[PDB]
Amino acid sequence: ARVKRGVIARARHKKILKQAKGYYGARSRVYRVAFQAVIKAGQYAYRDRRQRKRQFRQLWIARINAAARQNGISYSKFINGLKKASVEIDRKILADIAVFDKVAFTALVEKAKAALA
């Protein structure tokens, strides 16, 4: 029972090279290099599903800070005021409102200020 390896070996190498499309030079052409590039891409993607949550929260906080200071209050005091007013809107939504409905955001700032006073 001798087994030739060609058909299965070709399929495996082809799977990796298909995952390597768009990479530069040997990284999209050469199995040895493409395999390392596919693995590293997977490692980065695992890491950056976690990083993505951090980076978006950081963006929302920055935008809320800008909108709050347009309305005369810092980010930290604005958040403390909302918490004292029992308002549970999250930062994603607060940033969305800060960009798209400035009147509603001003109303939220007023609620926070009243709670702080």
Binding site: S86, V87, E88, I93, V103, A104, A107
Partner: peptide
């Protein structure tokens, strides 16, 4: 519902 905004009328839940 945490908040309802219709034009200039804004209702903020607490919560």
């Amino acid at each position: 519902v945490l908040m309802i905004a219709n034009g200039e009328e804004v209702k903020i839940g607490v919560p």
